[PDB]
Each structure stands twice: as C-alpha cells, then as structure tokens.
Amino acid sequence: VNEALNARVAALAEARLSDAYRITDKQERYAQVDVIKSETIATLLAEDETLDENELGEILHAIEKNVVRSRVLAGEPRIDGREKDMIRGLDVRTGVLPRTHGSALFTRGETQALVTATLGTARDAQVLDELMGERTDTFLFHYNFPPYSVGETGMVGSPKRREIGHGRLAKRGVLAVMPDMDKFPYTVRVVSEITESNGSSSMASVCGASLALMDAGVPIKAAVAGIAMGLVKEGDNYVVLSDILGDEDHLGDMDFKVAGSRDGISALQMDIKIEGITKEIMQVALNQAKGARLHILGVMEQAINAPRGDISEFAPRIHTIKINPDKIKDVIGKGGSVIRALTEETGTTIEIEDDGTVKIAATDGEKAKHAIRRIEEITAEIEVGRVYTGKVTRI
C-alpha cells in the first residue's frame, strides 16, 4: 500500500481540495486546486527527497477523484454545475457549408460535430470480401478526430478504435431509420469531423447525421439522437448521470450509450466495471436516458421538422423522358455526330436506353436543362402545324 506517504499527503490536501470543489467558477477552481496541489507537493518534498510526479501526482489525483466521487454520491452539484439530470446547452445549424449535398453543425456544450452527407449512383457502392460472406454496403459512415479537437498538437491522422468504435456505434444508430433501396435508389456516405471534444463525441455524430440526412432530403423514417450516460454506485446507494464529460470517466462504474427515435432504441452499448448491478438498476438507468434523449430530439425537430422534397441541386438527379422512338435518328446522327455535338456543347451525358426513353445527367441543373431543352426542339417538339413567330436568323 505504502500508506504512510498516502496518509501524510491526504491530511495535507483533502481538507483544502474539499473546499476548492465548492467554487462555482471552472477557472478559479482549477487555479486554486493547481496551487494547493503544488504546495503540499513541494512541502513534503522538504521532509525528504521523496518521489516526484511518479508518486506525488498519483497520490494526489486520487484524492481528487475520491473527492468528486463522494460529492456526487451525497447529492451535490457535479463538477460543472449541472445536476444529475440536465443535458448541457444545445445549438444546431443546418446548411452550414455551401455546395455539399447536405450538412449540419451539432453542439452540446463543449462538444461539436460537423457532419455532411453525399449521394452516389449505384456504381459508387462499396463491395467487400469477408469469411462469413461477401457484401455490398449502400450506406457508408466515416469518423474523423483531428488533434486540435482536444486542444493538443500531434499526428493529424492517427488510427484507433477511438475512431472505429465511434465510426461503428454511430452507423448502427442511424442504419435502423434509413430508407429502403426501392424507395431511395442512391448510395449515401455520411462523414462527421469532431471540431471539438470533451470525451463523448460519438453520440454528437448520430445527432449531426440525422440533421445532415434530412437537409440532403434523404427520406429517413424519423430523426435519431443519442445520449452518453454513467452510473455511480457505493454500497447500496447509487446515482445516474444524464450527460457525462470526458473527465468524469472516473465517476462512471457502468456507462451506457443509447440512441434512437422518439419511439424506440436503434443502438445500445454498455460496459459494467463493478459487480452488483441488477435488472432493477438497469431498468431505471435506461428510463432516465429516455427522458434526456427525448429532450435533444425535441430541439433537433425545432431546427428541421422533416426531410426536404428537393434533392440538393448539386446532387445528381436520375430521370428519363419518353421522346418519339422513331426520332432516334436525329439524336444519333451519322457516326453519332449529333450525340458528339449535344454532349460536348451542353456538357451533359446523353443516352437513349429503351423504346425512346432518354437518360440525361450532369453536376449542374443548368447543363441538364440546356440538353433537355435542346432535345425537346429536335424531338417531342412543338411543330404540329399552327403559325409560329420566328426571328429571322440568316438570309
């Protein structure tokens, strides 16, 4: 145990740490704690050349965690002022980026996710070899966690389950509410970049994805939001924390992440580090999570009520028109001459597919309308017989 050093440092600090945590200002607390800390750090350095951070810090951090621990169990405001049921302040804005198929910024206190959706043709679907059987995914999710998000320098790209966890949890959360391929023909990719983080940012990407998809006009069957929960237990007594910071990790003995619509769970993750959880405790834990999740989904619905009817002008729009099948010839031409002329001027890809059906595509609506307008004056054309006012072009 090495208790003699444990006891002496506890006597020097506990009485002053338990004072400092009552302070309402985040910054003055931090400042006062960092002073008490270094003092008894140094003061017992006087008694002997005892250890440095190697032991002191540790013996100290523990006193701190035990202090927050007892404060939370007793029934005192948590380290950030909130009680044991208040998700932090929310702000939500949509269409935040120009010329993306649909995009949103979701914010919960210090946590932010910037999320964007992109539409592909059936050709853009990912196809993959696995031992249990090869698969084709029409829904794709990517999660990026750059170092500035946590206020630190380092490698801009670093791969960890910190990201594949949050890349997979978020996908499971949204996958349940996606439209079926026969209603919505496009492949969809969503990417979430965590612009800033206080630990719990996977669930901010679920909320941001639901906004980004509605903005893009994907017909998702309902909005989906997520909450990060923790439970503190000591003897028979326990308390459940509705929305939990990246540093109150120590408080959580069981922490569970739950995501869904107003009327059912879509994904659930739980880790239980301490024995003596029972079905009764899990029942009340999820019942509190439901209250918080239903609050967030209310604020999201106020920002955007339903998915829009227009697919983003820039996103590709599959369509076809039935022009006169016999008129094929003056849209082909000798050696495909009027195909080459139409496709190069209009910058639009053109096909005749089946019995006079024309398929036409580009990035811009301008190009597509130009092409359509051009083929509607060669074929399906207003030339029945009645008199027309013509501008004289050449003589």
């Binding site: 804005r93 910024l105 206020g151 320098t153 970049e193 800033e196």
Partner: protein, 237 residues
Amino acid sequence: MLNPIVRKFQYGQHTVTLETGMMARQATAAVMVSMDDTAVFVTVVGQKKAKPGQDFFPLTVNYQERTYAAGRIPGSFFRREGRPSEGETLIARLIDRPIRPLFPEGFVNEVQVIATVVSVNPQVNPDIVAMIGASAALSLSGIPFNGPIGAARVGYINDQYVLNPTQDELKESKLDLVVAGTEAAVLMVESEAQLLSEDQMLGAVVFGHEQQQVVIQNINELVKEAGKPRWDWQPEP
C-alpha cells in the same frame, strides 16, 4: 449562444467571407474562409510551455482535401485517400514557405496549422484561399507573429495582367504566378510561364503585391474586432 463574427470584403470579382467563434472554439484560433463557393476551415494550435531541451522551431502545416467537398464518394483502396498525396503536400509547402520566417527570432514553441477543404466550386482553386485562411488563423490567435500575409495568383492574357483567374481563364493564359507578402514587402513567388521575358515576370510580381493589400486591410479589421490577446512571450536573453 454560439455567435459567428463575419467580415465580408471583395477581391478580384469574387467575394471572400471570414467567420470566427462558431466552431472548434477549443483550438487557439479557428477560421472558416470562403471565396465564392470554395470554402476551407483553417485552425491553429500552439502550446504555451516551450520544451526545456528544445533549440529549433517545430512548425507543422497539414493541408487535406475531403472528397465530400466536391460531392463524390472516394472509390479508392488506400484508407479512402488517407495518406497525403503530392497534390496536397505541395500546397502545404506553399503555406509553410511564407509563414516560417515571419515568427520572431528565438521562438521555439510547437505550432500546428491544419487546413481542411470543406466545399469547392470547380472554377475557384482552394490553395490561395487556404493561404489567406492560415494568415487569418495565426493573426487571430495570441501567438507572436510579425503581421498578416496576403496571397494572390496572377495570370497573363492578351497582354494584360489578371488577378485570381478562374480555372478556365488559366488555360488561355501564358502565365501562372502566386505571390505572398505583407504591407512592407514580398515574401514568396512561385511561377510557370510560356517563355516570358524577365521584365514581364517582375510586372506580374508587382501587380500581385499592389492588390493583395485589400486582404491585409480586412484581416486587420477582423483581428481588432474578434482577436484573442497577445501571449506574454519574451525573447531569450
């Protein structure tokens, strides 16, 4: 609650817009710069405690092009274009070269600049938007840095200089030249030319530098309206 501070000026027939405060609020400074539809999110982090052993300046600049910025799925083998290509590494060098000597003598704190392209109109190149974004993001922060930098691209068409040509005008032009500089002086020039005379090249450099000044005017207006206080950093005696 979240409140963005925006200053929109004008610049060679396009209209740049600078936004702050709204996002990555935990970075030292963060700016969403956007000319026309080409938008790039640029963020600075620098650590206040200089490593006690250190004896050089560890500046790192990372420029990354997200494919969702053009509304295309990746469709590639290597980590969905995870590693930076040549096409990205060169643009990082174009940001590094004018910035690196403009930090004060004896500064040794680690600094990291990340520029991520989040939208692109195909006619307006994001590189020189990233360059004015890096200028904004350094100058908004407390970090000790010798004044803002502009950036400009000059073309040559029918014997007239053209500021910021679009990607179509560029193919008609017999010159492609980037300039970066301060109120006082040019810092960096890089160019391709179809066998122009040395006089025509310096004409381009002067013309570029004379009108990148409008970027410097607007950056200084944002800095005193929304800038963090300067670090209490002093030179090593």
